[PDB]
Design a protein around this nucleic acid. Structure first.
Ligand code: 2KH
Ligand code: MG
Ligand code: MG
Ligand code: NA
Length: 327
DNA sequence: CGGCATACG
DNA sequence: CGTA
DNA sequence: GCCG
């Protein structure tokens, strides 16, 4: 088992679901406390289990696995022996964990905002609604639409949205393309949002595109919220339903075609996969990776990629299709 | 011990 | 600060 | 919290 998640296939469904979910609770709780390092270790340990070919049934099967030390091993030991880990259950029922989860789930609220509200004594969504002067416009939208945004987006919803995005994109710039990214590209059947990447085959034609797309979607009555030159937009869309509609989060990204493989890789995820890939690039290969390119700081040159396959090859990694990037 | 991804709105 |  |  290699130490980095980008060195091994991780499928969407696997053989250690309950163990990985427990470790991910501890990761989330670490994040709520500001401990990024412990969040990373628990996430990485969880992801190792996702990559295993069969269920862990005995503690000895963790020997030698990366990211399993005394703490993560004890959690697994307790789950194997008793079906429950007391530390995990204590986190689950704690007021701090439940409220931070509730608040950080709001669009426009991160850990630092949630923590401040917690310390001020706020505990419920209605607590926040009763003091709406202290909310950003983004938080107001996240709170108004919170119930709909709490409903999973279905793969059935994605086809309808991609068609309306393509229509607006086609009027804004004929020949521009729309690619589904994020979790759905990795094979997820549901999601918290829909993520799209937009480009044009002629380098430079994509400049100025996203304002033109957003204005057109807004004219069609499809935009319930957006932030407004820009190249990423975090929107709330009106999606039809039988007899009505529901609010759905949609992310749009524009990239020049020269950067498209890097933007596609960076937007396809998973989040942990991308962090691990960027860490691998810099620490093992001495190259700096982001969603625009791959830089050699010794030659001061950028690597021209025509595909995601190119990027894995330039990093000396076996290619992983999106469905195996579910770290 | 230092390090823990990286960029845009 | 928020977002991906 | 764990790795190197
Ligand atoms: O912190 C982050 C968040 C997101 N991303 C990148 O942006 C992509 C979309 O980010 P996302 O927040 O839409 N997550 P996704 O995997 O689509 O699952 P879901 O919760 O169902 O929407 C992710 O898959 C990563 O590639 C990061 O690189 N870092
Ligand atoms: Mg998504
Ligand atoms: Mg998204
Ligand atoms: Na949030």
């Amino acid at each position: 088992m290699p130490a980095y998640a980008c060195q091994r296939p991780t499928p969407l469904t696997h053989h250690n679901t309950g163990l990985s979910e427990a470790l991910e609770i501890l990761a989330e709780a670490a994040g709520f406390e500001g401990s990024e390092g412990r969040l990373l270790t628990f996430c990485r340990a969880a992801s190792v289990l996702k990559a295993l070919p069969s269920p862990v049934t005995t503690l000895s099967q963790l020997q030698g696995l990366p990211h399993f030390g005394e703490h993560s091993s004890r959690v697994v030991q307790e789950l194997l022996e008793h079906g429950v880990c007391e530390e995990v259950e204590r986190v689950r029922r704690s007021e701090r964990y439940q409220t931070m989860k509730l608040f950080t789930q709001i669009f426009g609220v991160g850990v630092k905002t949630a923590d401040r509200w917690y310390r001020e004594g706020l505990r419920t969504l209605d607590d926040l609604r009763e003091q709406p002067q202290k909310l950003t416009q983004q938080q107001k939208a996240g709170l108004q639409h919170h119930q709909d945004l709490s409903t999973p987006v279905l793969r059935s919803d994605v086809d309808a949205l991609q068609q309306v995005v393509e229509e607006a994109v086609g009027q804004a710039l004929p020949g521009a393309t729309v690619t589904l990214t994020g979790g759905f590209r990795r094979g997820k059947l549901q999601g918290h949002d829909v993520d799209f990447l937009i480009t044009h085959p002629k380098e430079g034609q994509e400049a100025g595109l996203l304002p033109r797309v957003m204005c057109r979607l807004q004219d069609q009555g499809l935009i319930l919220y957006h932030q407004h030159a820009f190249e990423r937009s975090f929107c709330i869309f009106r999606l039809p339903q039988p007899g009505s509609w529901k609010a759905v989060r949609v992310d749009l990204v524009v990239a020049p075609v020269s950067q498209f493989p890097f933007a596609l890789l960076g937007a396809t995820g998973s989040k942990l996969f991308q962090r691990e890939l960027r860490r691998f690039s810099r620490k093992e290969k001495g190259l700096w990776l982001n969603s625009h390119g791959l830089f050699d700081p010794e030659q001061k040159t950028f690597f021209q990629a025509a595909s995601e396959e190119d990027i894995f090859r330039h990093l000396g990694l076996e290619y992983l299709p999106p469905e195996q990037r579910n770290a």
